[PDB]
């Protein structure tokens, strides 16, 4: 939690529980990327909100809609387990052949 | 952290540290709202990524770009302390009169 910002047991439960980030290392051979989070319609496709990216050893909080996702990037996001499943299919596995 | 998803000390540091959410209760008299996160250009304006909203007692993870912000809503977001300051100015205080 952030020092000198309000604290409570209830807030901590949320921060630690339903808001705990998920993470997925994008495959090195994912070919449909090199495009912005905005262009990729991530929330529409998966339900996820991306909160951070690690790109070539650099961790970026709040990448925003104009950041690009490249193969190999490590994506951090909020959601639930079903969002995770959709993120796995969208970034790595790919429906169809 | 999420059970059966990968864990490490380094990941925990990130989750607990730079990714810890901030939160701000939107003022009840903020008059420029009732508009979607997308329309409000939140990242452009503030640098923030909204991860959750509490609206009239209901907490919503990953509200996404099509959710509306209304006066009184509780917004949760990632960023840094400067993002917090910009969020405070954008949602509540308002530059100018």
Author numbering:
A (entry chain A), B (entry chain A): 117 to 213
Could you pull the original sentences from the published paper?
BusR is a member of a yet structurally uncharacterized subfamily of the GntR family of transcription factors that downregulates transcription of the genes for the BusA (OpuA) glycine-betaine transporter upon c-di-AMP binding. BusR satisfies the overall domain architecture of the GntR family with its N-terminal winged helix-turn-helix motif (wHTH) and a C-terminal effector binding motif, an RCK_C domain (regulator of K+ conductance). Our structural data, supported by biochemical and biophysical data, reveal that BusR utilizes a unique domain assembly with a tetrameric coiled-coil in between the binding platforms, serving as a molecular ruler to specifically recognize a 22 bp separated bipartite binding motif.
We purified and crystallized a construct comprising only the RCK_C domain (Leu135 to end) and solved its ligand-free and c-di-AMP bound structure to 1 and 1.2 Å resolution, respectively. However, a symmetry related copy is present that generates the dimeric assembly as common to RCK_C domains and as observed in our full-length structure. The apo and c-di-AMP bound crystal structure of the RCK_C domain show that c-di-AMP binding induces a subtle rotation of the RCK_C domains that results in a widening of the binding pocket. This movement pushes residues Pro179, Gly180, Pro181 and Phe182 (chain A) further out in respect to Trp159 (chain B) of the opposing chain. Thus, it seems that this interface locks wHTHinhib in an autoinhibited state in absence of c-di-AMP, restricting movement of wHTHinhib and thus impairing high affinity binding to the operator sequence.
